[PDB]
Known about the structure:
5 chains, D: Foot-And-Mouth Disease Virus, subunit 4, Genome polyprotein (chains B, C), Genome polyprotein (chains D, E)
Amino acid sequence: TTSAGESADPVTTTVENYGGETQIQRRQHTDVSFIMDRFVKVTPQNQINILDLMQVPSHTLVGGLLRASTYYFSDLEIAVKHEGDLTWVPNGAPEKALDNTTNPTAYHKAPLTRLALPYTAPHRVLATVYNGECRTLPTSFNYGAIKATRVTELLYRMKRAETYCPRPLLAIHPTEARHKQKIVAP
Amino acid sequence: LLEDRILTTRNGHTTSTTQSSVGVTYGYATAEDFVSGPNTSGLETRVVQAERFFKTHLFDWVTSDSFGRCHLLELPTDHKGVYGSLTDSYAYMRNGWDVEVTAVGNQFNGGCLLVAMVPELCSIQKRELYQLTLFPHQFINPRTNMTAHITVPFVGVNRYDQYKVHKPWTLVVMVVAPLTVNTEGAPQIKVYANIAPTNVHVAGEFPSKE
Amino acid sequence: LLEDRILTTRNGHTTSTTQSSVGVTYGYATAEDFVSGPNTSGLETRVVQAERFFKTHLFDWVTSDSFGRCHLLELPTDHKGVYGSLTDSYAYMRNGWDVEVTAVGNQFNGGCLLVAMVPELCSIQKRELYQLTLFPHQFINPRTNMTAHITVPFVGVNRYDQYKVHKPWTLVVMVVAPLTVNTEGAPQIKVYANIAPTNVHVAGEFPSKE
Amino acid sequence: SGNTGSIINNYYMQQYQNSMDTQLGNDWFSKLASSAFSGLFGALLA
Amino acid sequence: SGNTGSIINNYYMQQYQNSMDTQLGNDWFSKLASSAFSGLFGALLA
């Protein structure tokens, strides 16, 4: 079809224009909830870890896709391998609170602790990018913090995720005409 | 020879008319979300007198600019009029933006500008410019038009903002194809913005300096 | 010993309460006349944010002041807040005044002040002070009260004014009987005014200085 | 609703399993994608 | 009723899980806080 390209109203032509037939699509794997809802590994600090989703690397599926939104909301699950007992404290707690066991403390049980945590920030949504200083993000943008004698593995999993205002999602830039890879084959 | 795509926008006692219109892009929403929430305890008020057009030069599009040349304008910007004084009298504000960007040369120029309203734009990378169309946008392409118009609501992690430390929106203009002048084109195009704050609400009145 | 004549006036987000009230004097009218006439061509608007209390010291009533000692305050006066900025942004304005004058010593003082709102008060003669009660007024008399409250509409040969060259109202406070302190009175009384612009309408927006 | 697939009901109340949402007073890109023009614009021939 | 959130019913009888209360024959601070005067007391003007 021709159209006015200056305008920005979306134009979606179909193969019917030259005699084909549009087929049915099933798009549940690109549903935001579904796709954000799986664990991703972060490298932990030894003891105090503040729970901040911007720690997940930007090349991972969850990091790539979280950065493709500018505001988001979710609850959280974490799975942690740690020595000692693990204390979590909510958003806004003094760091010293991480040593008081009436704050949610999970006693060590091999091999790891899986915990469901609520969204706890004072904001109606959080953001992956914030134009206040222009890199740094307000300190209230976090899900609390955890502490144990040593934490060895930390994985985050976003629950009930919502995303607002999409932002660039970039693939590898190939050096040759196609990015070629060894694909799993018999 | 010339065109009947004719629009008049009126914001307060200021109006702007173009005859090469292309239409307006509404970004992210068609109306503002709730202007009264718990964080202002019913003390917020609308100040209609600030809802009107102010003007700023952006840059001069010249044939030596190439793909990716950008101009950013964080919003709110300096304003020496009543919107500007609102920011010194109230601790919290929210407003959307009605934005008109003009690039007038003539129809014998070629090349193309993309104008977009991007939220939280803490600077952009080069490869990301290929995806700037994910943001509310419109193009200016001389064989068709001279004006881009985008209307956007207030956005942010907070229902009211402190503009002295946070800028929610950046207007960006990017050269996507370089300007050509050929024998009859204008020799360069100055790009100007005509912008109106929309729905401005304020809360939290400051002392004076007296 | 003390009193239940208790009033709270609220003007915008500012309130003022006295327990020695005496009531309010309404001068010349109970409501403003038409705020929209031919001289502003429907371009006038109300700006509710300027309708709130601001404060100024007037003078210190001392035992050496005698009958006829006056203090005048032309209105509008300097205002470093949003009403004050209105006068630099619009060429024409109109508003009334809600006026509260306070003189607190204690009930063992004697003497008497007359507070009046006079229009067009290009100064006063001495014999005319005997007839100052022709103007909207109230007395402050320490054995009874500490606050005078007068509410007055906009007046003038023109429906909108240019306050940079004309002052329609002057608040005047006059000693009608000299202050006595005796053994328990306060030794002097500072007189303060708490004033709110009412019904403020503006028309004719100015350029900025940019 | 994301990646969850148990048929039986949660042992914990909803008020413990998740935060609860409150109200005041695919939404935009779905509406946007549905409004896309899919026609022609000429006169068609054959 | 405090911090408890299982939807299914306890396996043990109530008489084993808790002590049982007996009767003879937010109560006070709730009533107190509800009775607070929230008015004005002058005459209001405007």
